[PDB]
Amino acid sequence: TNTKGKRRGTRYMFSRPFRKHGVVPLATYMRIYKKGDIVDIKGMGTVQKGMPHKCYHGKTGRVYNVTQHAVGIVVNKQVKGKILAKRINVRIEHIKHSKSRDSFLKRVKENDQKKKEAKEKGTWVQLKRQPAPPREAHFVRTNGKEPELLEPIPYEFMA
């Protein structure tokens, strides 16, 4: 059936958000990117140079190369039955950083300071995180008053 054009099906994803058109804000240009860090790929449509393909929109890769206006990114793409690492040159209006890796790095530094304080003070403290334990038996005060009696309503047809 359909064409193999490079922007087929990108009516909404390469568009701008509502009341967000016009001039690109300059913080997106004055971010910095060192080779090795994790970036999200979105791909706005105000800029037509260096824009990523629709398979790479909404993806996440790491930077391997920095140039004047663009960045080489290593992204995992799933061709039919294998995952392979593609190397795409994308511009900085189309990328942004990754708060997931940022959060991981700050809990790494927190772990390191916590292990240092535990070692100097002579205790053993918890460093891992545990998945949401059960709910720790407790008392529920009624505060003297009786719990309110709920009761299903009769049926009435409005709409």
Residue 94 as a binder of RNA (CB under 7 A): the answer is no
Residue 1 as a binder of Mg ion (CB under 5 A): the answer is yes
Reported as type and span, the H/E element at residue 66 is strand 59-66
Residue 42 as a binder of RNA (CB under 7 A): the answer is no
Residue 74 as a binder of RNA (CB under 7 A): the answer is no
Gap between the Cα atoms of 1 and 8, Å rounded: 13
CA-CA-CA-CA dihedral for 54, 58, 60, 65, to nearest 10: 50
- Please list every residue from 2 through 21 that binds Mg ion, using CB under 5 A: 2
User: Closest approach of Cβ 148 to RNA, in Å?
Assistant: 15
Closer to Mg ion by CB, 45 or 101: give it: 45
Gap between the Cα atoms of 73 and 90, Å rounded: 7
Closer to RNA by CB, 17 or 144: give it: 17
Contact 61, 75 (CB under 8 A): yes
Closer to RNA by CB, 18 or 139: give it: 18
Contact 147, 158 (CB under 8 A): no
86: partner contacted, choices another protein, RNA, Mg ion, none (Cβ within 5-8 A by kind): RNA
Gap between the Cα atoms of 29 and 94, Å rounded: 10
Size of the site for Mg ion (CB under 5 A): 2
- Please list every residue from 98 through 157 that binds another protein, using CB under 8 A: 157
Give the binding site for another protein (CB under 8 A).
157-159
